[PDB]
Amino acid sequence: QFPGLANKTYFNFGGQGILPTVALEAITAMYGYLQENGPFSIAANQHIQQLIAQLRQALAETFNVDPNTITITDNVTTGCDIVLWGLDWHQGDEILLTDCEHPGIIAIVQAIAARFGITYRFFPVAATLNQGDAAAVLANHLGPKTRLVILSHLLWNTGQVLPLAEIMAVCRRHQGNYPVRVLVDGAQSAGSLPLDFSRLEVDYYAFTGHKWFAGPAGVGGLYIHGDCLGEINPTYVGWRSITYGAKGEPTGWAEGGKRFEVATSAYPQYAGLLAALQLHQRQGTAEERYQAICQRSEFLWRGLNQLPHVHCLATSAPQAGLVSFTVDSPLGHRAIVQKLEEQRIYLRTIADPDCIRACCHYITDEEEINHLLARLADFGP
């Protein structure tokens, strides 16, 4: 089902997943449908609307929520932009972000701070991978003007799964000028951790389809709890965002998540993500896949512990499929990742902390892990 795995040793799912054959077939079939029946026509436009609704529904079912809470986007970042630019910020309002957030997300925050006169402070979570409590660190940083906390459910740099439920309680127990809300960056978590937003109570959860879900680059989504929808004003909008009047004029915002969708998008790619989502559910439940992912990451982590010059950041088994580690060598992590790539072994360098990250998916196997171990064994001080 995943042809790209065969002639390589891939551990970069968190960067982009290997596209399954059913996804490529769906993409290709959609271009064909458009060429045959349109591309612009009553038939083609109806087929596109039906496709969009099917993908919105598939995502909704994935997270066990109502389709109205789902916005389709192009990537994780756009979901964060929609939430951050849509909040009715006031001068002096404060945003707290962990010290492990993506530089792109930090950039939106700086842009917001410049535009609305809000302020932002980081709180340290990287150091809580093996000890401490990230929820308690947050409690020690909440203030009177704190309105939004931004965190990645699964940290892209260290592989820690933040204690989201406990963190939500902490924010909800806080008595301040604002009911503290939390925007979750789910780039690594969605598609690997079992996520059920009925059971787990969240405010805003941004994700993408091109990483753990193994969809094509260019399609992602955003979840907004039904009760937080009214707090998010549309910013980037267009013809997909509105309801229409008698003369084709705008009369209001489209229902639910649609108000945040803009204009023409890569429709064939939506069919690709839908097909990939369906393939995963056929393999087993999110829970079974998650256990399989952990089985592989612990196997890799154990092997790495056995190599004398490799040092895993985590001192206990990985909580998900990310395994970060350093290598004692005169070379530097960037050179080591390049040398591994020359051997068709694919990992990624992490800037902070300075280390190397491997991603194990449920489709990763022991021979791949053992091959990675074999090649790393050669680096030394």
Is 364 labeled as ligand-binding? no
Distance of alpha carbon 61 from alpha carbon 70, whole angstroms: 10
Find out whether 47 is annotated in a ligand binding site: no
The reply, when asked if residue 371 is annotated as ligand binding, is no
- The footprint of ligand PDA on residues 146-175 (CB under 6 A) is 152, 156
For the record, the structure tokens of 174 come out as 């806080």
Query: Is residue 102 close enough to count as binding ligand CSS by CB under 6 A?
Result: yes
Q: Is 264 left (phi over 0), alpha (psi -120 to 50) or beta?
A: beta
Distances (CA, A) of 128 to 149, 176, 202, 336, 357: 17, 26, 22, 27, 18
Single out the residue of 82, 86, 87, 102 in contact with ligand PDA (rule: CB under 6 A): 102
| Residue 77 annotated in ligand binding | yes
Q: Is residue 192 close enough to count as binding ligand PDA by CB under 6 A?
A: no
Residue 102 marked in a binding site = yes
Q: Where are the beta strands (DSSP E) in 187-226?
A: 204-208, 220-224
Backbone angles phi, psi at 159, to 5 degrees: 85, 10
- Binding piece for ligand CSS, criterion CB under 6 A, among 29-37, 99-107, 204-212, 298-306: 99-107
Question: According to CB under 5 A, which residues from 259 to 318 bind K ion?
Answer: 305, 310
Helix 76-86 crosses helix 103-116 at what angle (to 10 degrees)?
Answer: 20
**Residue 179 binding ligand CSS, by CB under 6 A:** no
Q: Which does 76 bind (CB under 5 to 8 A by kind): ligand CSS, ligand PDA, K ion, none?
A: ligand PDA
- How much of the chain is in helix, strand and coil states, percent to nearest 5? 40, 20, 40
Coil, helix or strand at residue 303: helix
53, 136, 235, 239: which one binds ligand CSS (CB under 6 A) = 239
User: For ligand CSS, which residue of 39, 104, 245, 332 counts as binding (CB under 6 A)?
Assistant: 104
Interacting residues with ligand PDA between 222 and 241 (CB under 6 A) = 238-239
- CB 373, CB 303: distance < 8 Å: yes
Bridge partner residues of 323 (DSSP): 358
Identified binder of ligand PDA from the candidate list 62, 71, 77, 192, rule CB under 6 A: 77
> Which positions make up the binding site?
76-77, 102, 188, 210, 239, 264
The site for K ion (CB under 5 A) is made up of 305, 310
The residues binding ligand PDA (CB under 6 A) are 14-15, 75-77, 102, 104, 152, 156, 185, 187-188, 208, 220, 238-239, 263-264, 348
